[PDB]
Design a protein around this ligand. Structure first.
Ligand code: NI
Ligand code: NI
Lengths: 110, 108
């Protein structure tokens, strides 16, 4: 099991939290000044809202695949390199790749 | 059992199909000129690729929740409206976030 992660850079964190609470019918799991997390069961989704003052519209910050444990990150990382994609891994585990249009993807364990 | 729909406007559809096939380990379900879509089981995702032509970078086109049946759409439509969001309905419902990001609830 895994779920997608969608991380949005939003102009108004408070308005966005209010909106996403109503859309998915549940409050954020974690709230800090500067970002909030929703863990949505249905549809399965980890939604990250990142305050991006200055910018005037919501844009994509990055995308991700949240997997159950580190071994899955490892399998993903190996498979991605095998397919010939450039990757960068982090420990404390996460692997990053970038789509041809520049959209960043991370495979990670929460 | 619903799934998110992620629609990306991409500068190069062909390279993108190649990239997502590798990323998710499975080819697209449907391909037309200017358009491809992937139905991914794990993680559950409908990924839509839309040829942009012009833009220099991928951008979010729209977002969605894909549900199993017409009645699920009707339920979401009533829920969203009752919760005070400004919705437009139909079987499809559209709502837009404060930052202008468009959402739709729809059936496959
Ligand atoms: Ni993240
Ligand atoms: Ni769509």
């Amino acid at each position: 099991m895994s779920r997608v992660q969608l991380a949005l850079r939003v102009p108004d964190l408070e308005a966005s939290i209010g909106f996403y609470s109503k859309l998915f019918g549940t409050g954020p799991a974690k709230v800090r000044p500067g970002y909030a997390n929703f863990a949505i069961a249905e549809p399965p989704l980890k939604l990250v809202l990142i305050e991006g003052a200055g910018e005037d519209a919501t844009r994509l910050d990055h995308l991700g695949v949240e997997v159950e444990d580190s071994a899955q990150v490892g399998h993903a990382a190996r498979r991605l390199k095998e397919s010939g994609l450039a990757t960068v891994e982090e420990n404390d585990d996460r692997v990053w790749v970038t789509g041809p249009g520049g959209e960043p993807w991370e495979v990670y364990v929460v």
